[PDB]
Write an enzyme that holds these catalytic residues in place. Structure first.
Site, PDB file in Angstrom:
ATOM      1  N   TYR A   6      19.240 -77.291 -59.345  1.00 37.93           N
ATOM      2  CA  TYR A   6      17.995 -78.025 -59.328  1.00 37.93           C
ATOM      3  C   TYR A   6      17.436 -78.433 -60.681  1.00 37.93           C
ATOM      4  CZ  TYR A   6      17.824 -76.316 -54.453  1.00 37.93           C
ATOM      5  OH  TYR A   6      18.027 -76.031 -53.123  1.00 37.93           O
ATOM      6  N   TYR A   7      16.611 -79.473 -60.662  1.00 36.70           N
ATOM      7  CA  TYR A   7      15.944 -80.009 -61.843  1.00 36.70           C
ATOM      8  C   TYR A   7      14.677 -80.610 -61.267  1.00 36.70           C
ATOM      9  CZ  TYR A   7      20.277 -79.710 -64.564  1.00 36.70           C
ATOM     10  OH  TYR A   7      21.394 -79.315 -65.252  1.00 36.70           O
ATOM     11  N   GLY A  48      24.760 -72.153 -35.933  1.00 34.00           N
ATOM     12  CA  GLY A  48      25.987 -72.788 -36.385  1.00 34.00           C
ATOM     13  C   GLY A  48      26.564 -73.697 -35.314  1.00 34.00           C
ATOM     14  N   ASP A  86      17.982 -80.603 -40.905  1.00 27.94           N
ATOM     15  CA  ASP A  86      16.798 -81.427 -40.765  1.00 27.94           C
ATOM     16  C   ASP A  86      17.006 -82.420 -39.621  1.00 27.94           C
ATOM     17  OD1 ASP A  86      16.977 -81.641 -44.410  1.00 27.94           O
ATOM     18  OD2 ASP A  86      16.396 -79.977 -43.104  1.00 27.94           O
TER      19      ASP A  86
END
EC number: 2.7.1.45
Lengths: 301, 301, 301, 301, 301, 301
Positions: free
Chosen positions: B103-104, B221, B251
């Site tokens: 991440y950033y 799953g 999602d």
């Protein structure tokens, strides 16, 4: 034995494959960059024994930096992956030329760099220690480190080379000024651009009076450049080539000038050399992609 | 009038074009992602009137998010670019399947989100307000915002849907636990995975006893999934398809289940629907690329 | 200190991006290959200290090999570019599977390799010296070199590993046979495929009687494989995965088995390990692309 | 409230990734185009509230147009997909510059456009209504529509802007002439190129005498251009940039000039502005790709 | 009936997609080349009935050559795949322009060519037989073949055209000189460059005195060129275009001049024509990609 | 002498590089297609002497068709570019499989085809004349042509092969029915799919009773297929392979069956052969890309 040693923060460049606003791209090319890094590579490509000092995160991007450096032949005696992340940035070159940059490096493993970051004896026997004004602007640690570093190089009879590289993003012209005035004493070789001189001393004239280092080279866009040594001022070959990706020529140039000096070449050849480097990198996409290899000079000879 | 409203932090995904370690790639594909975002799009693609709430920086990446959302038909009444930067991340899918993420996004304009981030009346007449456990994990502001947000939805007779999505990166199972225990009361619809239940309640069994929301769906799953409503437990169709890029099916699935409900469909069809979405996105590269369009269901009908 | 040392001729692979006849492609991907090379990399990726010995031309392709090796962490103490050219080859995988290969390596700087190609003391303290039946088939120099090489390894208490790899292109089953019969005495570890055994001893049965080395492993396509040590015959896990680019699994496998041994693992784990490697490389485009990294095993553990 | 309203037929451009004959390409890039469209986007990108009116087929290409427009922020109050197909075209730019174009738009849903195509009150309060000479050339419906349209704009105190754009493909210089002579009365702002003036009035001189609209701007290739207002004739900045894809600069320019006027800027700035736009789009591949965004001007300011 | 017949060795070009050192590329484009070949195609594209004579290996690359020729309309009456391999080569264009080339053609099926390689009656009725100084430099067979070939063309009242093309790689200026002095007698049309004249006769002046063929054309870089016929010396149009890939313009030019002559055009038009060709191919990537088609001239007319 | 002759309208396929809605793609691959064309190529690739008859526009796309055909070895004695344009179409394959197609071919030079389109003597000595139900559906000219064509083939003792290929886009099941009932008499070999039989005769059963041609082959998806000759009904091998791009297997299959017959092979081998072709093309992107070459069968033998 190492001829040159440089130090700084490595960064990963992300760049669109063609001019246009970043917002519109959907494919970015990945390149390894970072002034000092760009420089180490260039030299490395020319046969110069050089070592890089710095840190990167324990992430896939860090690994990449390392592979790249390692592949190029740079000495990583004092380079390693450390906890944290690797700084990266996104670039974008507009149709009419107005580029803009976006950073994501604050707090990176590489922006740590504090005095003692490596063993000083490393510097021993070395010709030059090169640095960029970008490093000390990162953090007070770095700032300290920098001073510390050339102090140590001085102490070891190592020539100190510095490429100003003022980044407004990192700090103010005052701070920059403050830094320089404190650092100049220990500088033997200084690289500078006109804008930077203008932007920090009003005129490219005053800057020279103020920052009178043993040897100073002034980059003047495509109008060649001038070298200042022994009260003398040699002018360099201007170049009528169009920039592809002018994002690293500045470093390439310096490297070029460095290689010349390391080979003990007359200022004329050093310049000649420097533009050659700059030109090549500018004519290529990527931070230091385009940097020529020793055997190329040979054929070009 | 809007049927669904979701809120979260948008992020830009950078992904290699093929399996392998990021360190080796040199070309990354650019995708728009972010749980809530992935969901808004999916719904939007299905004909559902949905609105997204959130912020992005005033950068080219932000612009990109916006274009993408706007193009998809999402309501951006309370979405805008603001000073700061846009969060982004790099992904990498290994040959044998061990993926890893970088991440950033810390400190991004989008991670601001504080209570009152938008006008509550927006929520009026809306069927559902969807959220992800990722948002409250970003910052205390967000955390507060989240609570605030469903509070307001509740206050407006708006159904609250929540996809747990525990990110170890953002916080601890304890904090997560703490959050939920405080939030569950206001949840009408909850989405959860087995690992998450195991990882936060020891067993997928206890989790159910503890988090007894009016309606709870458990992702299991490829073994289908189970829906829990009216003390009943319908099982969903398991899917024998291989994941291409399973990074957003979670999602998609939720969205899918949401569309069903919005259309007042029997739990069976909602599930059926949900796997269908999940499957399609999983079968495609990109966070929500692969999300089908309404007219597709129609032909498939 | 080096744990493994391998030697051979590096080659550059040119491959179409998708199945079909080469005649129709117009874009070829560039990969670095060469049995021994593929193996050195694999090991290198796993944390094994390995060194490669060989030569390449003073061409851009050679440079490429070197960068790649260097980047991977391979010891190039006795590897260098020399006058001449670098061998390369073009591949093509047909829709129904009938692949075909085209070489352009005869007379390459790399096919020189003659006895004494490096300093024998290099071998000192090393666990294994690996070779492929491809090298001795290149030229009589090589042929001699090979014999010389293991002679020296033997003389240094270094285990000799050999992957048969019969190339009909280079020589006849008789010559091959002749070579082996002369070489086997000095082999401690031998890698072999069924076709090869059949093709050179009529049956996979006789081959075993004839070539009875201290340890012999027989690759049996997707039907696992068998290990022969201490009159024992352990069977390996068969793999139900479809080949993407099976052009290097053979080497990956060997490497895999090597790593296991270097780590002094029970034959069962060595096999297990070997298929794992083979599988990963086979599941990826490129000669050794797909070779996993140490930290991957760790997560997989 | 809308400041500008334009109308025309949207088309999908297919273009090779590099110079050369279309017959040889095998990969074409997809772009959204159409004079009026190119213009609406440009304005939209500059912050101008603009609306587009037109039709497209109920096909995937139509959907694309819509997404694109919607993403750009254009008002589609009176834009929609309708039975029929979407017009498209193939382009090709030769090495030495001789381009050629191929259409596939006859009978498209978009070429329908007849008087009353939208509700006139839409025009109310609007500053300008822009049109291209391409629309009326499509069909007699369109032709009628056009006349109808500005009639209505006039009737609403809306300024009528027209970019001649003579397409020999659609009709003869006589018909074109006929159209103009009938239309000019209702034009307040007219955009024209030298060739077009020459090609329809013999000389760029007569054309001016004949078509004396309140305000007329003449594009003169890279030799700047001239603005004609209040018996005055300001000259614009000529541009020494090389065309990448000059296929939409004409529209970009107009848009640019429009934005200036909408902001009530002195003719000088309007021109300045217009070239800026044209330049940017010309310097980029795609019909209107390269069109700058408001915040760009800001930095450029 | 054939108007032109050419003969030589076909080769497959491998070229990076952008400037830079080959060592760094990882994707190479595949093109079909070979002076004579480049020429046959060009003519073929212009409507000229031309036939090619030569051999290629029975490999996928050979097949490719054939398909390509066949597709272009070249007469392959005396062209075929034969045992052996197809020659190929790798190119690389540096940022500042210093290109370098690597061959892999020695011993190719195509470098066989010996006297009688085809049936002489083929030549009957033909206008010209074109050759390059590259062919005779390949092998003594070829050398002989060449002589044989024009001998036969002469014998059939067929005009002999020759493009010097000195390749230092194949032989010395002395050998080249020797060849020419022996060949010139049978040449009616000769193509030559300044460097070549300088490099083999000291000055572009002496070369002319020595090699006084009925008609001689001297390529002079971008400074146009000069035609020498009937003691006359017409000068050709110089071209202010920048080279993209100048690797085949030399041939394109010749072809161009050939087409002119075949059409019995005044030397002026032949030159004009020739630069046009050269220009087009130079402005395109690939050996002869960029060669225009007859109908192009027509529009350009 | 030609063994097979086929005729139809060539079309250019534009296809996204990956599943998903066309509206979202931005890069389309260019392929040459057209039932009859797909078939001519397949055969050509197998060594069968085949000729194609048809027209294309005088555009770059036409040129492309021609090159492609010519390169493949197809006889173009009666094929040429003519005034007008070349038909093309866009395809799109959805994640879950619902494909959709868009045409742009109405009025194309290729859709002209009227009786006498070529010289009947061409047909002389030929084994078969193949046609698709697509051609007669294009225009009444075509319709007539078709009838005319087989009439002539019949008259020359040429076997008539027909692949139904009902396109709802072109016409109604009634018209189709009408056509067949009028054409069947002259058919010796008929290719048909289950859906088509169901869709035009209610049941795959009635269709058989109605359309009782000397030899009829029924494609039954992946459930093999059945051949009907001499009141016999051989069943073909079913195939458990997943479609990549099933857009041309239908033709490949036919071609395959044709090659078999041309080689006078037992119905069993013809089927076997046919699936083999179909499978290969289905397993590859592109209309007929994936079609195997004669030498492939050989290795596969």
């Amino acid at each position: 034995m190492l001829e040159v040693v440089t130090a700084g923060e490595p960064l990963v460049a992300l760049v669109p494959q063609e001019p246009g606003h970043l917002r519109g791209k959907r494919l970015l090319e990945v390149y390894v960059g970072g002034a000092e890094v760009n420089v180490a590579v260039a030299l490395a490509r020319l046969g110069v024994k050089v070592g890089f000092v710095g840190r990167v995160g324990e992430d896939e991007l860090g690994a990449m930096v390392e592979e790249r450096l390692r592949a190029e032949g740079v000495d990583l005696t004092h380079f390693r992956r450390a906890p944290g992340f690797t700084g990266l940035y996104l670039r974008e070159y507009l149709p009419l030329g107005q580029g803009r940059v976006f950073y994501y490096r604050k707090g990176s493993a590489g922006s740590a760099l504090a005095p003692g970051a490596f063993d000083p004896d490393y510097l021993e026997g070395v010709r030059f220690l090169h640095l960029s004004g970008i490093t000390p602007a990162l953090s007070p640690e770095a700032r300290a480190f920098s001073l510390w570093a050339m102090e140590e190089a001085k102490r070891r009879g190592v020539r100190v080379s510095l490429d100003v590289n003022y980044r407004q993003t990192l700090w103010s012209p005052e701070e920059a000024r403050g830094f320089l005035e404190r650092a100049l004493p220990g500088v033997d070789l200084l690289f500078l651009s006109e804008e930077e001189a203008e932007l920090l001393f009003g005129r490219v004239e005053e800057a020279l009076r103020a920052l009178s280092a043993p040897e100073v080279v002034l980059k003047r866009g495509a109008k060649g450049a001038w070298a200042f040594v022994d009260g003398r001022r040699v002018e360099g070959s201007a170049f009528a080539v169009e920039a592809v990706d002018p994002v690293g020529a500045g470093d390439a140039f310096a490297a070029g000038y460095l290689a010349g000096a390391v080979w003990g070449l007359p200022v004329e050849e050093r310049l000649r050399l420097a533009n050659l480097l700059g030109a090549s990198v500018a004519a290529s996409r990527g931070d230091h992609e385009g940097a020529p290899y020793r055997e190329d000079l040979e054929v070009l000879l």
